Amino acid sequence: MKLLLFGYGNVGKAFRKLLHEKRSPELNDVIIGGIVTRRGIMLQDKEDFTPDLEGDVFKAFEKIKPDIIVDVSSANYNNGEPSLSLYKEAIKDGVNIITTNKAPLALAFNEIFSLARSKGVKIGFQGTVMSGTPSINLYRVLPGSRVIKIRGILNGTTNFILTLMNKGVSFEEALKEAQRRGYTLDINGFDAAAKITILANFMIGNSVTIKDVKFEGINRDLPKNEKIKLIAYADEKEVWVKPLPISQDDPLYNVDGVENALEITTDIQSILIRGPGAGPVNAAYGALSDLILLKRDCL
Amino acid sequence: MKLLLFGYGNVGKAFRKLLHEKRSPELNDVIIGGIVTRRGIMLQDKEDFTPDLEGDVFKAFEKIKPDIIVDVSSANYNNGEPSLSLYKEAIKDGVNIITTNKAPLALAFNEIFSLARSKGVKIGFQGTVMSGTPSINLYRVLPGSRVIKIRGILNGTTNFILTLMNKGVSFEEALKEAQRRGYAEDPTLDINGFDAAAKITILANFMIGNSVTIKDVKFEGINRDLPKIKLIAYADEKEVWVKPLPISQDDPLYNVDGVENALEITTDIQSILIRGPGAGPVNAAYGALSDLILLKRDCL
Prior knowledge:
Oligomer: homodimer
Keywords (chain A): Amino-acid biosynthesis, Disulfide bond, Metal-binding, Methionine biosynthesis, NAD, NADP, Nucleotide-binding, Oxidoreductase, Sodium, Threonine biosynthesis
Binding site for Na(+) (chain A): 129, 133
Binding site for NADP(+) (chain A): 8, 10-11, 38-39, 73, 100, 102, 182, 279
Enzyme class (chain A): oxidoreductase
Structural class of chain A: alpha/beta
Function (chain A): Catalyzes the conversion of L-aspartate-beta-semialdehyde (L-Asa) to L-homoserine (L-Hse), the third step in the biosynthesis of threonine and methionine from aspartate.
Helix content of chain A: 25-40%
């Protein structure tokens, strides 16, 4: 089974490493046939990217004819391209998709998944929400139950800053430190909004796009002497993201640092899952998990 | 596909109800060919149980020839019978098994699963641990990562009592309240840690892999000599135990209160925790229904 890996920053490199650690006999037959970035097309599997050809993901797709596309490229929220048209072409050609790239899903969920459903093509997208902590994939093992609402912390950067602020640290100092660690556009709540959009689509069955979500982020001026979290919320009627003061009896109170959490409420039960929501290995692991599930015929 | 439903107490009745709610198209062709209880064998799927024949689960099995056995019968921790023999006979007949009955798995996991793997038979057992809250099935979507250790709160009754004790209630008063809400009866058997030990045994077997039986678990319960304390069930490659321990405010198990259950799974890559409600007939039946759907998807 031949993969085309689209994107190769830290997540793409971590994925490649996971793949070479031979973690499941389900992946024995899996190779990376090509890697494409801004800088061109490498038609080999190497730790370091050196282009072999000039050209874009469409040229690479035609040349390689992969069985699976793994998209770990940067989210383009303006219009989702080129990943959006890439997924459509992959689906048309019977090529399964594994992705950590939120934009196409947050902009065009119903169109993409309807098209995939019709063609029997599979999409793994665990990596788009809460990295390697089952979220999408948790819902896969909650069959025959209707999700009524979801509430969570879905962004590592802002959780990390809000956690430090609660320890007496300044916004500015906290922001600095988040960046130093590998975490305007970073704190305005948008990332969480895209994530709740995807969850709302998948779990609630509410066909919404990032345009339907009321969100706002964090800043220097938030209330002092209160533990604040950036809460993402969706039910059958509304989808929003906003910073709220949280009380000690709230399950989300001690979800700190880059930890993320999702409270899923169904007809049968309310559950909560929590785990890291940032870190390239974690993101790469969400994609690896999808790849193994795909090989098991379980997406 | 034809099910044989072994047990028709609250879990079985809930299961039959969930099946009839048209919850997934995967269950379109699934019918219950028969229900068996202590009162005999009903060869029909009706809400109200009325036996058509006298006889035990083995007679029903031979008569119906089910594709799947769904075991929601009461756990017999003395020796796991008759469920243990039933599973072996089913496995050897190529009949898949969905179970909420902990006993055979707590006593003879490696024997049962080795046999199933040798025969290519599938076993759904999500319902045995944290009922409807993915636990077993959570691990099914955490592939390619070795589980190093697991820790959890696996028993609602003791957690409820300890939750009250942390808020300043005496052990005696907390137990009374537990008894008032029917969580404990002699409450001796409800608070001795055995239920948690059974569950952690199953989880250790499945997630960590080393053959362990309930006999290998060092477990103790709660009592009036405890001073935020939680009854922690723990397993790694070396050991499996249950004991009351103090938990820090930063610990993800800290607010797992009331009758809630939770499980923390630690791998090389990461630690994750899931929390849910822990016990109830509908919840347990939903664990079995989830297993059935995954079986129909061919994902067990």
